Amino acid sequence: SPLLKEQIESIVIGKKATVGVAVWGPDDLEPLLINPFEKFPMQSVFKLHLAMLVLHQVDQGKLDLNQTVIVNRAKVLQNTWAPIMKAYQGDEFSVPVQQLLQYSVSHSDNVACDLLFELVGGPAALHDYIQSMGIKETAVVANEAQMHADDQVQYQNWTSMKGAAEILKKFEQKTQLSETSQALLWKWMVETTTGPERLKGLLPAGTVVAHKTGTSQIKAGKTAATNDLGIILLPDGRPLLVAVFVKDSAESSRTNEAIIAQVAQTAYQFELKKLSAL
């Protein structure tokens, strides 16, 4: 739809950032893409793809949700966002895969993320999995530790807005995971504690939203990435897929999140307009 595209452009024009958007409503044949040729750093958004690969290996019986990993407090990535390190006491403890997944997805935990990467063969294994789903415009080459070591690396874990739309559609179609794995991932994405003022920012109270955020620190005067992508359930229970990636922004943190909230609200209102007519 040209009208929705124009409404979204009216939000991003004038903001000192480059914004990518993908909107796919339930009656749309193709998704609406804003800035389709730009490469967007994913930051923690790729923990979504990683959870799908891990659950896919659980579905195949290659991994078990209760399989546990020994965590040595001295050997994991130090001084990074890792809530799991505060959930257990001791210099050494063991955590099941089920909980590492929950912490990576819902809490965007960086240590849980890298521990999961180690069970499946690293970034290379995730990249193969993504390509195997037919998504060519998403690249994964580094884990959190490597992204932590060199701040240019984050740009190498990128996605196009078509790639963001496809991962949401694959997930939404419930064709990649067993019913159990699908229900677990939906649970962790609805329970996310991060980014409450992004996609969910201006939606009505009670709207169900399964989403995953991605954020970088302010370095060299800009925020490389402020992202949120997810599934919004409409009043009739049908899904609305929305992904918003704000790249290389020189705006305040508050403004970066408001761009995402406004785009989500505009897409949501547009779907109500269609339900209103049809």
Give me the amino acid identity at 252: S
* The CATH fold of domain 1-278: Beta-lactamase (3.40.710)
Give CA–CA dist 37/33, Å, rounded.
10
Note if 44 is an active site residue.
yes
Domain extent listing, the chain: 1-278
- PDB resolution in Å: 1.9
| Contact in structure between 25 and 251 (CB atoms under 8 Å) | no
Give CA–CA dist 254/113, Å, rounded.
27
Catalytic, out of 10, 44, 178, 181: 44
Neighbours of 195 (CB within 10 A): 23
Q: What is the 3-state secondary structure (H, E, C) of the chain?
A: CHHHHHHHHHHHCCCCCEEEEEEECCCCCCCEEECCCCCEECHHHHHHHHHHHHHHHHHCCCCCCCCEEEEECCCCCCCCCCCHHHHCCCCEEEEEHHHHHHHHHHHCCHHHHHHHHHHHCHHHHHHHHHHHCCCCCECCCCCHHHHHHCCCHHHHCEECHHHHHHHHHHHHCCCCCCHHHHHHHHHHHHCCCCCCCCCCCCCCCCCCEEEEEEECCEECCEEEEEEEEEEEECCCCCEEEEEEEEEEECCCHHHHHHHHHHHHHHHHHHHHHHHHHC
**What residues are designated binding site for a beta-lactam?**
47, 108, 144
Neighbours of 127 (CB within 10 A): 17
Residue partners of 140: CB distance under 8 A and separation at least 6: 46, 49, 123, 126, 127, 130, 157
Method of structure determination: X-ray
Give CA–CA dist 126/134, Å, rounded.
13
